[PDB]
Amino acid sequence: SDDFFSLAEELAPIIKLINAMLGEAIKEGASDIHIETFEKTLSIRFRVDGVLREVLAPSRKLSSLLVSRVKVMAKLDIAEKRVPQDGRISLRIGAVDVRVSTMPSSHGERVVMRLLDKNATRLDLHSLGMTAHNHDNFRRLIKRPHGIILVTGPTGSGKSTTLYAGLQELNSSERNILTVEDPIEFDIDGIGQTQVNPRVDMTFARGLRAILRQDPDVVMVGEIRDLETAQIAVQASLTGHLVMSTLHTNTAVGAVTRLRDMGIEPFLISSSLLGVLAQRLVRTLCPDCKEPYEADKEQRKLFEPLILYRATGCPKCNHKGYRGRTGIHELLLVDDALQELIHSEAGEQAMEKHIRATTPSIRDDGLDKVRQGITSLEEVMRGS
């Protein structure tokens, strides 16, 4: 039921159109949908496997309606027309994550729906691209009885993915693993998952307090945004729970800084923190069109002829010569000397200096993967 092109042949029905268009986009395997306004006409385009195409040019009159409709679905400001807006939608087709972005433009806000699959995001702990060392130390870390483990990085770092991987590795029936999320990304099975619900003042803080009355061995908090959730988090870790969470800081040592700045007692950070996994996503070079070169003298400084690889571009990729992505990481492990450094508020430079004797930086991690020709030198250097 409900074909986009049929419904297009007639000039709400604006709800049946949007759903049908989404439905047709998914049927075609399209990555993105574009609704744009031009002075004398309107335009709908679909991107499929790189290729962009016009699929419909309905009357200019419809533009304000299709824009509004996508807004209300993504939970946004119908009134606001002058500034960018970004919403989310979860939908069942017969499950699709659709990211909608709008934008002021010379004849009407432009809109794109980003349409991602829910499943390609579901990776296990050995499939995130951790090096053998990081993998080993991280697996030994999440198996500890109590303390806080933070997964950190900027937006798009893949922090939710590595939490889920970690939880799944622990998901035995000997453990009681409870979760509070905003929202839940999916169901794991074996793990009690709890969504934050603003509609009843069920916040991260309230939910996490409740979790502790359910006798958990491990608890996950979707993220630590305010002092209050940090306070409970730290108390939970100090009373025999293993706690896992995220911050959006930019370095492993910056996690400590962020915690202090938020107002957690420096001593209490130093006695609860087990470790901080800082993390970035780099695109993996398309193995089909990736081209070998010989590193020049300046590129060598960063590391016989040294063979690295470069992007290029082909149909099997599209926009650039990259298919897929992988993680690069830095795993901070707390020891006696570092506790002193945290407690004494020594600062980022002194903590980093200490950690380097044992652990390589995210850049070195990235550079190793460049060496292996998994990714380009550009892709690693641009985030650094």
- Residue ranges of the binding site for Zn(2+): 286, 289, 314, 317
Based on the shown chain and the rule CB under 6 A, indicate whether residue 155 belongs to the binding site for ligand ANP. yes
Per DSSP, helices labelled H in 29-158 are 63-74, 132-142
Tell me phi and psi for residue 145, to 5 degrees.
-70, -35
Other Cβ atoms closer than 10 A to 231:
18
The site map against Zn ion for 320-359 (x = CB under 5 A) is: -x--------------------------------------
Identify which of 32, 74, 12 has the alpha carbon closest to the alpha carbon of residue 21: 32
Q: Segment near ligand ANP (CB under 6 A), from 153-161, 172-180, 200-208, 354-362?
A: 153-161
Of 128, 211, 219, 277, the residue at the interface with ligand ANP (CB under 6 A) is 128
Based on the shown chain and the rule CB under 6 A, indicate whether residue 119 belongs to the binding site for ligand ANP. no
CB 384, min distance to ligand ANP, A: 18
Structural tokens at position 13 = 């029905």
Q: Which does 264 bind (CB under 5 to 8 A by kind): Zn ion, ligand ANP, none?
A: none
Q: Which does 317 bind (CB under 5 to 8 A by kind): Zn ion, ligand ANP, none?
A: Zn ion
Of residues 284-313, which lie at the interface with ligand ANP (CB under 6 A)?
A: none
Structural tokens at position 168 = 């799944």
Q: Which does 156 bind (CB under 5 to 8 A by kind): Zn ion, ligand ANP, none?
A: ligand ANP
**One-character DSSP codes across 137-197:** HHHHHHTSSSEEEEEE-STTS-HHHHHHHHHHHH--TTS-EEEEESS-----SSSEEEE-B
Based on the shown chain and the rule CB under 6 A, indicate whether residue 375 belongs to the binding site for ligand ANP. no
Of residues 324-343, which lie at the interface with ligand ANP (CB under 6 A)?
A: 325-327
Q: Segment near ligand ANP (CB under 6 A), from 136-144, 213-221, 319-327, 353-361?
A: 319-327
- Report the chain's C-alpha Rg in angstroms: 24
Q: Which does 126 bind (CB under 5 to 8 A by kind): Zn ion, ligand ANP, none?
A: none
Q: Which does 289 bind (CB under 5 to 8 A by kind): Zn ion, ligand ANP, none?
A: Zn ion
Residue with tokens 């980003």: 114
Of 316, 344, 356, 372, the residue at the interface with Zn ion (CB under 5 A) is 316
Which of the 8 DSSP states describes residue 78? S
Structural tokens at position 295 = 């590193």
Of residues 161-180, which lie at the interface with ligand ANP (CB under 6 A)?
A: 161
CB 158, min distance to ligand ANP, A: 3
Burial-class residue 153 by CB neighbours within 10 Å (0-12, 13-18, 19+): buried
Of 66, 219, 286, 374, the residue at the interface with Zn ion (CB under 5 A) is 286
Question: 317 to each of 123, 162, 290, 371, 383, how far by Cα in Å?
Answer: 21, 25, 10, 21, 21
Count of residues in contact with Zn ion, rule CB under 5 A? 7
Q: Segment near ligand ANP (CB under 6 A), from 2-10, 71-79, 157-165, 197-205?
A: 157-165
Residues 6+ apart with CB under 8 A from 328: 129, 279, 280, 281, 282, 362, 365, 366, 369, 380
Structural tokens at position 99 = 């990211």
Identify which of 32, 15, 16 has the alpha carbon closest to the alpha carbon of residue 6: 16
Rule CB under 5 A: which residues touch Zn ion? Answer: 286, 288-289, 314, 316-317, 321
What is the binding site for ligand ANP (CB under 6 A)? Answer: 121, 123, 128-129, 153, 155-161, 281, 325-327
